[PDB]
PDB file of C-alpha atoms in Angstrom:
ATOM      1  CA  UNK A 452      42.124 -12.291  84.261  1.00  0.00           C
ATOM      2  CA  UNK A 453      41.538 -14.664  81.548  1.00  0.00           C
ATOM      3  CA  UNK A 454      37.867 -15.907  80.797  1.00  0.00           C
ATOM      4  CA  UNK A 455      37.798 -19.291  79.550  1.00  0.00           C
ATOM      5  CA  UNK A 456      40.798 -20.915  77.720  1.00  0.00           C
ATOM      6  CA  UNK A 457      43.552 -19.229  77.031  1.00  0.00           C
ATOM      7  CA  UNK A 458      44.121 -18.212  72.937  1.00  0.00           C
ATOM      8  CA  UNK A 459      46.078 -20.744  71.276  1.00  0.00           C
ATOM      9  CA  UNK A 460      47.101 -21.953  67.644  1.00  0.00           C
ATOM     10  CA  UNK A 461      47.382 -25.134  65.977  1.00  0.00           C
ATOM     11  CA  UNK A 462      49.917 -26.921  63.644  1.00  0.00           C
ATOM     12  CA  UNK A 463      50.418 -30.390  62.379  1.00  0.00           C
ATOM     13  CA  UNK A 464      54.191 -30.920  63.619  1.00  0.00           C
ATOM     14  CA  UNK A 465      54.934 -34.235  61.637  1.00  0.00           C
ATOM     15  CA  UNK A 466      52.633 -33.802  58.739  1.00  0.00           C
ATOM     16  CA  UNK A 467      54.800 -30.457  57.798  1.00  0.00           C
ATOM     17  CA  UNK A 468      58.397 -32.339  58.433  1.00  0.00           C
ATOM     18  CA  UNK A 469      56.956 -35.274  56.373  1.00  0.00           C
ATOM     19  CA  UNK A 470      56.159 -32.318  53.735  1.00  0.00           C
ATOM     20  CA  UNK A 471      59.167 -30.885  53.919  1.00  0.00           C
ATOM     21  CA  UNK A 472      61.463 -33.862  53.261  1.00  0.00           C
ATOM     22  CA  UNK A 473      58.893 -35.003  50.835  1.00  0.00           C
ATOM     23  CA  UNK A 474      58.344 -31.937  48.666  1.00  0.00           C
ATOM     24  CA  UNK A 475      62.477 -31.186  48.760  1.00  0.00           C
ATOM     25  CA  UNK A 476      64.097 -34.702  47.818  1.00  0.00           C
ATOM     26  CA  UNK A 477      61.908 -35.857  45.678  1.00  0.00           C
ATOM     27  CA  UNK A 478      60.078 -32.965  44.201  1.00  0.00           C
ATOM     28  CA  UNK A 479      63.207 -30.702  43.067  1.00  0.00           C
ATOM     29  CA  UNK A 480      64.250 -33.684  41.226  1.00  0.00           C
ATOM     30  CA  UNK A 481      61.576 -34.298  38.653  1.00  0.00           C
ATOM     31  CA  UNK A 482      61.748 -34.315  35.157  1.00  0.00           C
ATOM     32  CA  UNK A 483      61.928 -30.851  33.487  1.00  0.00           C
ATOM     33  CA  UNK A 484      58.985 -31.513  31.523  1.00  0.00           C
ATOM     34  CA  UNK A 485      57.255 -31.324  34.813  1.00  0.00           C
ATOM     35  CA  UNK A 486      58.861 -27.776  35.912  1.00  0.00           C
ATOM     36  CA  UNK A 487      58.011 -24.454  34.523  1.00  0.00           C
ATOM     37  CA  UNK A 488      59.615 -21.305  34.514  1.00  0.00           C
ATOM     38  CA  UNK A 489      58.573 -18.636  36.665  1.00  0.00           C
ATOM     39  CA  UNK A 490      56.606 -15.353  36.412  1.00  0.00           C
ATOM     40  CA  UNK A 491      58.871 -11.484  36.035  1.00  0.00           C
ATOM     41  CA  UNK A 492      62.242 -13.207  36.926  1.00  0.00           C
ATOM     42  CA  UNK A 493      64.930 -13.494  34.179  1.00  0.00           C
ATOM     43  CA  UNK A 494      66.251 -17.001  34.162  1.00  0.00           C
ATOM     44  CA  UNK A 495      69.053 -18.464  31.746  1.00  0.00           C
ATOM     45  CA  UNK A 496      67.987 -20.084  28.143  1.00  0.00           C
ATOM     46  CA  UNK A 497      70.450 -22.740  28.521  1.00  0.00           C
ATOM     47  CA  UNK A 498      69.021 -25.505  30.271  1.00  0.00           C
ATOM     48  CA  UNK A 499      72.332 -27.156  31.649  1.00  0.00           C
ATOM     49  CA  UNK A 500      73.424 -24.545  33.826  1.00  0.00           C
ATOM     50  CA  UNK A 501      72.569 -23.782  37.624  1.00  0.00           C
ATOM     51  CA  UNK A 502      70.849 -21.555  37.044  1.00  0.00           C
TER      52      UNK A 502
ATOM     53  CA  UNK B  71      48.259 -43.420  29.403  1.00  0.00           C
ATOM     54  CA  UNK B  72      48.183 -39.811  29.032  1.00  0.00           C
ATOM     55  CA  UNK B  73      50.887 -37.392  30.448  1.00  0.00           C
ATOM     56  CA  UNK B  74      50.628 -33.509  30.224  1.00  0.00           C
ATOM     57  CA  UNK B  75      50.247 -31.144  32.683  1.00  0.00           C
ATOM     58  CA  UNK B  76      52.923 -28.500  31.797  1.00  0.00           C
ATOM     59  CA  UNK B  77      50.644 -26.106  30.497  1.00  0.00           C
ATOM     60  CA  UNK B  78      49.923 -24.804  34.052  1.00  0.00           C
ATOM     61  CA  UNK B  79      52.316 -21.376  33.910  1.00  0.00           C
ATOM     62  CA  UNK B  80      51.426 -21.474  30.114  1.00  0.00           C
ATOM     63  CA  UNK B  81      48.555 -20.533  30.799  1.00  0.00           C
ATOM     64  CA  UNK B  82      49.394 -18.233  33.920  1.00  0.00           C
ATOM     65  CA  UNK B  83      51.569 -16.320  31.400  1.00  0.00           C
ATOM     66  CA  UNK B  84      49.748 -15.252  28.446  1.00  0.00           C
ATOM     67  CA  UNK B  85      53.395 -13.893  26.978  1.00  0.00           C
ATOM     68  CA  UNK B  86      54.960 -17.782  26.710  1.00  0.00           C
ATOM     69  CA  UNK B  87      51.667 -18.880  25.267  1.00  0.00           C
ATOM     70  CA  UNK B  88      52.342 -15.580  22.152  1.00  0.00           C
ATOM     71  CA  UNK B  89      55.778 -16.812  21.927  1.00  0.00           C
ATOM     72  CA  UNK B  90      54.931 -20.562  21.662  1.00  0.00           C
ATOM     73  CA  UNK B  91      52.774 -19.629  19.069  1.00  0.00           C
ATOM     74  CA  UNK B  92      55.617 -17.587  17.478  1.00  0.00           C
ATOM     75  CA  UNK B  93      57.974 -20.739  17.625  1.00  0.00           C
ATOM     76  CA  UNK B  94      55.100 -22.952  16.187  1.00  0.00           C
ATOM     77  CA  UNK B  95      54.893 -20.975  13.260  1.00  0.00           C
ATOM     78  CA  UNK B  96      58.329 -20.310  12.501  1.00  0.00           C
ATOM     79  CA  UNK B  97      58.704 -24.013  12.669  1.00  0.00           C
ATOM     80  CA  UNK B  98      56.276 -24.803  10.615  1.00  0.00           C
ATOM     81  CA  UNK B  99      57.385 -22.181   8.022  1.00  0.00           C
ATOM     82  CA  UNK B 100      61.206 -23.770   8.065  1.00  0.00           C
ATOM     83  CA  UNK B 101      60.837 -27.229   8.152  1.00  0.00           C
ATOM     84  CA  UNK B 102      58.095 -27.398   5.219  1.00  0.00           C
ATOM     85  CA  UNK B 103      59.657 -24.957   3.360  1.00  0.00           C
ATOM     86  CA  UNK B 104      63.192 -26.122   3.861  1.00  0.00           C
ATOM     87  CA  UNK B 105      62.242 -30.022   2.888  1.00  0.00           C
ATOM     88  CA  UNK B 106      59.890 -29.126  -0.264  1.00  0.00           C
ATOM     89  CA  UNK B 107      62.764 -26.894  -1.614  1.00  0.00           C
ATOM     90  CA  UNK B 108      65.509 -29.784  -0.794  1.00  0.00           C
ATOM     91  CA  UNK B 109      63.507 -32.133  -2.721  1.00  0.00           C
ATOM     92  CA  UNK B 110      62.261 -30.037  -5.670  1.00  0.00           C
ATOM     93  CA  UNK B 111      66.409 -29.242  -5.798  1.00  0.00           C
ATOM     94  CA  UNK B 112      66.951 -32.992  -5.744  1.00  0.00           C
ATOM     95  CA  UNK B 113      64.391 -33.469  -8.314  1.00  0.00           C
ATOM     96  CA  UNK B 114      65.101 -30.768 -10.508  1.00  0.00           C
ATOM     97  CA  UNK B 115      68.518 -31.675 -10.654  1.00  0.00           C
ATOM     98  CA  UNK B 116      68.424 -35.050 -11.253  1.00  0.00           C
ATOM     99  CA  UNK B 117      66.143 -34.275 -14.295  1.00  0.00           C
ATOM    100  CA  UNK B 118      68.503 -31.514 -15.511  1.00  0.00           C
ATOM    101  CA  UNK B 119      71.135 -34.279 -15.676  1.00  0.00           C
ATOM    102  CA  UNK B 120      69.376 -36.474 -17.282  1.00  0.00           C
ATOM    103  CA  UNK B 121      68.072 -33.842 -20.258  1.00  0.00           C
ATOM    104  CA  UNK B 122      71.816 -32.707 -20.780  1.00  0.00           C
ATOM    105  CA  UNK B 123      72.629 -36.683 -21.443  1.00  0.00           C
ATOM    106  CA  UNK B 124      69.435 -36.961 -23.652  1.00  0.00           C
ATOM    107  CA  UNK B 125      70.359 -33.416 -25.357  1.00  0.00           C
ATOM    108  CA  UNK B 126      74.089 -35.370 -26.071  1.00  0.00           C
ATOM    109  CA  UNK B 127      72.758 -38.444 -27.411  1.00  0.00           C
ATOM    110  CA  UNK B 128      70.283 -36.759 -29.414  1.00  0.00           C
ATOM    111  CA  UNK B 129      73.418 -34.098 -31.036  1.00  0.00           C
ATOM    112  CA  UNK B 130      75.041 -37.544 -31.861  1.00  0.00           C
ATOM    113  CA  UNK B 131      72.440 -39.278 -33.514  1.00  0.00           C
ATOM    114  CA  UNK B 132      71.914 -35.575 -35.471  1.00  0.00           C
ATOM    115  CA  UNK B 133      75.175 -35.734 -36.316  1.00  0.00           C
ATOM    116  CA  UNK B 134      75.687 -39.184 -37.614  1.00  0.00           C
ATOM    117  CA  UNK B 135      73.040 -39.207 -40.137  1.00  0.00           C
ATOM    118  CA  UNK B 136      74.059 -36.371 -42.906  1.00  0.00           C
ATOM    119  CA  UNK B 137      70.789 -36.509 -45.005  1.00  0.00           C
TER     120      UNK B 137
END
């Protein structure tokens, strides 16, 4: 038998879908400038590719 | 205004920082080396030009006065 209330978690539901659609359309469109490259993963010198 | 923040994984990777520094000073070495030799070129052959005219006028006037 449970004592007292059950164990239970907690999560901001629209807060992390605002995030989400926030951080995706408008953050992995910023200016370059504004990017950096990564840490130990080879990525291409030329800037215009995909990449 | 003021706008730079980029130096965030600069300094999270000591390596770009070494090689920024590398590229700094290669820069530095080509373009002021590259534009004082242009222009003491430029300059030096301008003046050679205008000695070898000099040098011609000066043979003339030599020549056409036969002490």
């Amino acid at each position: 038998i449970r004592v007292g209330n059950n164990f239970a978690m907690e999560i901001n539901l629209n807060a992390n879908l605002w995030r989400n659609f926030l951080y995706s359309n408008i953050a992995l469109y910023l200016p370059d400038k504004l990017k950096y490259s990564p840490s130990n993963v080879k990525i291409s010198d030329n800037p215009n590719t995909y990449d | 205004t003021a706008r730079g923040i980029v130096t965030d994984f600069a300094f999270l990777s000591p390596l770009a920082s070494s090689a920024a520094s590398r590229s700094s000073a290669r820069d530095d070495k080509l373009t002021a080396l590259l534009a004082q030799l242009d222009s003491l070129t430029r300059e030096l052959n301008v003046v050679s030009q205008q000695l070898l005219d000099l040098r011609q006028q000066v043979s003339a006037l030599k020549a056409s006065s036969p002490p």
